[PDB]
Amino acid sequence: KEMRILMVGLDGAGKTTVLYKLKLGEVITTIPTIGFNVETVQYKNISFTVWDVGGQDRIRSLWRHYYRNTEGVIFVVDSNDRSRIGEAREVMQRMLNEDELRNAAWLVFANKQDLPEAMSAAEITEKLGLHSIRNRPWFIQATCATSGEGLYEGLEWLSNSLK
Amino acid sequence: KEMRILMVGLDGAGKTTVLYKLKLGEVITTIPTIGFNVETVQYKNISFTVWDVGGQDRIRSLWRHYYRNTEGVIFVVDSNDRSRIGEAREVMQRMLNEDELRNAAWLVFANKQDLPEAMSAAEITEKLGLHSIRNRPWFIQATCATSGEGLYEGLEWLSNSLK
Amino acid sequence: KEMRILMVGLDGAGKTTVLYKLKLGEVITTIPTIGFNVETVQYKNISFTVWDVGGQDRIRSLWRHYYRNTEGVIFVVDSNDRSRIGEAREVMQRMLNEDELRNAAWLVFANKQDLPEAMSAAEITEKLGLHSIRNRPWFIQATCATSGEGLYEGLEWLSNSLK
Amino acid sequence: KEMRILMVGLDGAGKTTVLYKLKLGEVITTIPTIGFNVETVQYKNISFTVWDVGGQDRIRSLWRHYYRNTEGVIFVVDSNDRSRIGEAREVMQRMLNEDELRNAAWLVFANKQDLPEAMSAAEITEKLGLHSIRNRPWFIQATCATSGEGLYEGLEWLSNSLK
Amino acid sequence: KEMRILMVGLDGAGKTTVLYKLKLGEVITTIPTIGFNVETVQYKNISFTVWDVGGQDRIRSLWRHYYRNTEGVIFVVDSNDRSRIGEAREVMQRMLNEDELRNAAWLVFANKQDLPEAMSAAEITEKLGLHSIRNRPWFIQATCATSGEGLYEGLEWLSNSLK
Amino acid sequence: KEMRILMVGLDGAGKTTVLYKLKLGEVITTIPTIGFNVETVQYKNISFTVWDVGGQDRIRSLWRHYYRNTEGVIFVVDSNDRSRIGEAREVMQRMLNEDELRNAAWLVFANKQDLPEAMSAAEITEKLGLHSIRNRPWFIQATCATSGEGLYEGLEWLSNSLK
Amino acid sequence: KEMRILMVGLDGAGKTTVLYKLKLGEVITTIPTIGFNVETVQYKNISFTVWDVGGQDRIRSLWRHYYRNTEGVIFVVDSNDRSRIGEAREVMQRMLNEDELRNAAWLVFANKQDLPEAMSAAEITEKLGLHSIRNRPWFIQATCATSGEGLYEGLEWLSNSLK
Numbered sequence A, B, C, D, E, F, G: 001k002e003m004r005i006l007m008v009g010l011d012g013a014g015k016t017t018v019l020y021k022l023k024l025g026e027v028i029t030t031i032p033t034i035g036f037n038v039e040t041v042q043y044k045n046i047s048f049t050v051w052d053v054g055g056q057d058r059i060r061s062l063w064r065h066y067y068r069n070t071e072g073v074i075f076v077v078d079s080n081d082r083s084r085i086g087e088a089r090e091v092m093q094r095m096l097n098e099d100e101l102r103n104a105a106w107l108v109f110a111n112k113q114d115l116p117e118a119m120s121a122a123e124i125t126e127k128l129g130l131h132s133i134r135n136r137p138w139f140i141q142a143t144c145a146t147s148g149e150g151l152y153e154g155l156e157w158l159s160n161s162l163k
């Protein structure tokens, strides 16, 4: 009936694009997210309330204001960006150790799969150290926010962890 | 209705893998256990509370904090490691002489039986000097935490020593 | 109205098979009994609560936990196994000297009579030294748990020692 | 209701094996007894408290600490060891002259009768000079601690000298 | 639930950087620590209260004000600085002899491992004389405060010595 | 319930190593013992309080401060050091004639048996003139403090002389 | 718990430097000691109260005011000063004959060992006639107050003569 979500990731990942592809159905032009966007999207008789936030180094320290009462998390990672996959691992291993996100479900959108140099979801699952997760449910999906592929299959998995 | 367990052993044995094969049912990737893990698993209307600890030489001296109120012990030994079977014997003969574990039940998981060079449970029973045990109930089971074999047959024996 | 029973014996005897031939009516496939099974069976307006236990050498030392409040005992002996009839005699003469089983009724299921090499109930009565019993009522019945023969004639005798 | 016993003898006799055949029912592996073992065993509504001690030449001088308040003594002699039957005679004639064991009952376990070269209980009764005993009740029984033969027939005789 | 920590070391080690890498997650620019910094960081449902202090020769004499009620100590040593490893040994052997830190747990951050000329944790364990510690638990971890490596594995070990 | 011990010997013997192998279970690096170390170790429901002291010629004259109220003595002798076995004999024959140690139990740890040139416990028993002891109980055990062999068999013998 | 000490010696030896290396941990600049300095230093749960005095020829006659109630003495000798080793011998042989220092423990700090021309502790032990001491415990340690070497090993020996 209701669910709260927090979309996060590094800069350039695709968070805003994913959100406004789910909410509107169209690919909008984007500006860097200094503040935050919040939007409700309905699916399977469930109303997800997604909070997209900034990924710039200066806003990554303000994500803590949103950890509270968060039932799911969506970590978006740019697959073409193979040089920052270590920074994302640091961020995610730091945010998995926070106690406010202790029960949160973990979903990972490996975005930008339409690009030729994109890296597979298994290569990302290995590079991010996702099998090391033990206190938490987790899942990884390959997406293309510009085409909508894999986006409605993530909200479908998040439904498993309802209530 | 309840029971407390302490899983111990040398490094590389299989303690964490056993615990999260009982708790989750899947084989997780692992990191060395510097601290401790604690997990409750239900079976036969009994809720075992297992404490997995480190086996590095530096943490083997911190096991004493957990001996108290411990009703069962699970000593995991790597069978393929035939060069450290003497060190495990030292550790176990030292920990059998402690007075806090005076009534504790003893179970021995001879793990890594899937490997070709693995050593039989009787060869381990002879090398560990288990028949020398007289103040304590004891039992040895051959396992394969990656496949789950022999794991639910140890919790089954630990039930004999309930209450 | 009620009665408590303890089924015991060596390994391979037929305890589990007897129990789940009385309770279900079918011959189940079996695994070695590491722990214990407990089942209530009704007959002649009496509800027998049978506790089947392991016979492996390592579990024969845990039978003492069950001697208390036990009103009848059922010693199952494999008749085809003519090489272990001395070990069973040792076990039974040891367990007849325990003071918790001081008033318990003794029944002996000489099982596996369907086999050609099976030994008669009188040969077993002589080999087990059953006439030497003087502080206790006793009885010996020839059975075939696979066919149910002689099983309902043992519960019938146990009724004699009700209340 | 209660009784105190002191099991003694030379090294290699079978004291520890006898004790943990009476207490557990199984034949344990053994280490030389440097200190002492103490165990309570129930039989015929009597709780014997047996103290098994070392037989090495260096511990034979520490037996005096246990003579006090001792109501029965069990001298175990290896029958196969026909070369040390004189040393045992010396030890026993010395310990029969002590005034703390003035009323103690004497029992003699001629152990290791399963061996082919074993010597009869009458040959031992002659070699040990047991008929020379006049201030004391005495008895000699032929045993086999590995099989339990003759062990429960000694505790049965010790009951004669209760209270 | 709570724990008090004292981070100390020589000048240039990395104490402030470690503290504000644990607390904020970012590498801050630094000024010499004339006074003291104090910050609470949460991890594993535990709230560590860390006190970072100066290492200049003039402030090393004011550390005594903080020894009291200190449950853990974190000695940070610059590995690249191979010319001052003797001065750190002097400081640490002096501060191990103080009676206010009598029960304190010892952790050693061998920092600046990202530098090519860095010295291994075992070379430091030998140069600092850490095996000579006998009245105290101790542990040594290799770190890189600029990248966060090895920092959350020290707070994990400090949890072993809780309460 | 309690017992007081004094570990003594020449320099290089293994006293400190033995003590902190019993207390911690690990082989620590060592410095010459100028003062004294004191540690309590529990075993068999007994709490031995061991006082390890220096063996340098200058501290051998300060052992007298500890003779009082000493219930056991542990003389450690280096077996590889076959050139100082006469000096140890002098020291031990001098300290056996003191009246404060009149009732003390004597134990001798012939240490460093892992070395190839080590001398047997009987050769040491002959060289030290241990059979000449008549006013005192005594015992000699062969050890290897680095491996723990023979160490828990000495505390086991010291229990014989309790209270 | 408490102990009183008197540090003495010739001029230029290192008394003040030793005292304020023990008390503060730093090497202070110094002025000739016309009067006296007094400082308490804690170590091994003992609070030594050290009195450093002048060594000028005019103050060497005022040391008598401090001999009373003195439990230990620390004679500091400059090793580089090989021309005044006879004057120190005179002073020490005079102060050993005083009856107020009749039970005092003797410690000798052979300081300034960092200098190349320094003389060994055995050469000093021979030149000072220390083996001639018979009514007193004594000890000699080689130091370097500028580096702290050998200073905490003297207070460690002084603990032997506590109470």
Ligand SMILES: Nc1nc2c(ncn2[C@@H]2O[C@H](COP(=O)(O)OP(=O)(O)OP(O)(O)=S)[C@@H](O)[C@H]2O)c(=O)[nH]1
Pocket (backbone or CB within 6 Å): A010, A011, A012, A013, A014, A015, A016, A017, A018, A030, A031, A032, A033, A034, A053, A054, A055, A056, A111, A112, A113, A114, A115, A143, A144, A145, A146, A147
């Ligand atoms: N070619 C391609 N571009 C994508 C894809 N997904 C997202 N993008 C594009 O990549 C750019 C970055 O996406 P954007 O949503 O603006 O970043 P962000 O996640 O919000 O992070 P920021 O707000 O801090 S800059 C955008 O131009 C967006 O259109 C994809 O699947 N393929």
Ligand SMILES: Nc1nc2c(ncn2[C@@H]2O[C@H](COP(=O)(O)OP(=O)(O)OP(O)(O)=S)[C@@H](O)[C@H]2O)c(=O)[nH]1
Pocket (backbone or CB within 6 Å): B010, B011, B012, B013, B014, B015, B016, B017, B018, B030, B031, B032, B033, B034, B053, B054, B055, B056, B111, B112, B113, B114, B115, B143, B144, B145, B146, B147
């Ligand atoms: N091939 C094989 N590997 C096994 C088996 N059981 C456990 N392991 C593997 O052996 C490795 C060590 O197991 P692990 O559980 O991490 O050690 P530990 O007992 O926790 O000890 P540590 O935490 O101090 S490193 C792991 O890679 C694990 O997957 C087995 O039965 N077969």
Ligand SMILES: Nc1nc2c(ncn2[C@@H]2O[C@H](COP(=O)(O)OP(=O)(O)OP(O)(O)=S)[C@@H](O)[C@H]2O)c(=O)[nH]1
Pocket (backbone or CB within 6 Å): C010, C011, C012, C013, C014, C015, C016, C017, C018, C030, C031, C032, C033, C034, C053, C054, C055, C056, C111, C112, C113, C114, C115, C143, C144, C145, C146, C147
């Ligand atoms: N041919 C034949 N097999 C029998 C008979 N009674 C029991 N068994 C068989 O003998 C085997 C052993 O019986 P089982 O009940 O499993 O042993 P147990 O008494 O439980 O002892 P355990 O659990 O310690 S292995 C089984 O395969 C069982 O089916 C019989 O009358 N005839």
Ligand SMILES: Nc1nc2c(ncn2[C@@H]2O[C@H](COP(=O)(O)OP(=O)(O)OP(O)(O)=S)[C@@H](O)[C@H]2O)c(=O)[nH]1
Pocket (backbone or CB within 6 Å): D010, D011, D012, D013, D014, D015, D016, D017, D018, D030, D031, D032, D033, D034, D053, D054, D055, D056, D111, D112, D113, D114, D115, D143, D144, D145, D146, D147
């Ligand atoms: N073959 C055979 N061995 C026996 C018998 N009784 C005891 N033993 C064996 O003889 C050996 C010595 O028995 P043990 O109990 O250990 O000596 P002890 O009486 O305790 O004396 P010790 O402790 O000073 S070494 C053991 O290996 C034991 O198993 C027997 O009846 N037959």
Ligand SMILES: Nc1nc2c(ncn2[C@@H]2O[C@H](COP(=O)(O)OP(=O)(O)OP(O)(O)=S)[C@@H](O)[C@H]2O)c(=O)[nH]1
Pocket (backbone or CB within 6 Å): E010, E011, E012, E013, E014, E015, E016, E017, E018, E030, E031, E032, E033, E034, E053, E054, E055, E056, E111, E112, E113, E114, E115, E143, E144, E145, E146, E147
């Ligand atoms: N290259 C590199 N620099 C590091 C590392 N860890 C810390 N530092 C850097 O070394 C410098 C000293 O660290 P800093 O934290 O300021 O010293 P301090 O421990 O606080 O001691 P002080 O305050 O008395 S000056 C800083 O410029 C810091 O950024 C590292 O792992 N690699």
Ligand SMILES: Nc1nc2c(ncn2[C@@H]2O[C@H](COP(=O)(O)OP(=O)(O)OP(O)(O)=S)[C@@H](O)[C@H]2O)c(=O)[nH]1
Pocket (backbone or CB within 6 Å): F010, F011, F012, F013, F014, F015, F016, F017, F018, F030, F031, F032, F033, F034, F053, F054, F055, F056, F111, F112, F113, F114, F115, F143, F144, F145, F146, F147
């Ligand atoms: N190879 C070997 N070394 C041993 C053994 N037992 C003790 N040692 C080693 O011999 C050395 C001396 O032992 P140590 O305990 O320091 O002397 P001590 O008895 O305390 O006497 P001291 O303090 O006056 S120097 C140490 O390096 C120790 O590790 C052994 O069994 N084998």
Ligand SMILES: Nc1nc2c(ncn2[C@@H]2O[C@H](COP(=O)(O)OP(=O)(O)OP(O)(O)=S)[C@@H](O)[C@H]2O)c(=O)[nH]1
Pocket (backbone or CB within 6 Å): G010, G011, G012, G013, G014, G015, G016, G017, G018, G030, G031, G032, G033, G034, G053, G054, G055, G056, G111, G112, G113, G114, G115, G143, G144, G145, G146, G147
């Ligand atoms: N190079 C070197 N100098 C030392 C050492 N120990 C002490 N000193 C130095 O020698 C000088 C004399 O030491 P000091 O403590 O002032 O003399 P004193 O013992 O107090 O005697 P006084 O007060 O009557 S002048 C000082 O400059 C001191 O720093 C050492 O180990 N090496």
Ligand SMILES: [Mg+2]
Pocket (backbone or CB within 6 Å): A015, A016, A017, A031, A032, A033, A052, A053, A054
């Ligand atoms: Mg955005």
Ligand SMILES: [Mg+2]
Pocket (backbone or CB within 6 Å): B015, B016, B017, B031, B032, B033, B052, B053, B054
């Ligand atoms: Mg682990």
Ligand SMILES: [Mg+2]
Pocket (backbone or CB within 6 Å): C015, C016, C017, C031, C032, C033, C052, C053, C054
């Ligand atoms: Mg069964």
Ligand SMILES: [Mg+2]
Pocket (backbone or CB within 6 Å): D015, D016, D017, D031, D032, D033, D052, D053, D054
């Ligand atoms: Mg024995």
Ligand SMILES: [Mg+2]
Pocket (backbone or CB within 6 Å): E015, E016, E017, E031, E032, E033, E052, E053, E054
């Ligand atoms: Mg700083």
Ligand SMILES: [Mg+2]
Pocket (backbone or CB within 6 Å): F015, F016, F017, F031, F032, F033, F052, F053, F054
């Ligand atoms: Mg020592």
Ligand SMILES: [Mg+2]
Pocket (backbone or CB within 6 Å): G015, G016, G017, G031, G032, G033, G052, G053, G054
């Ligand atoms: Mg001065």
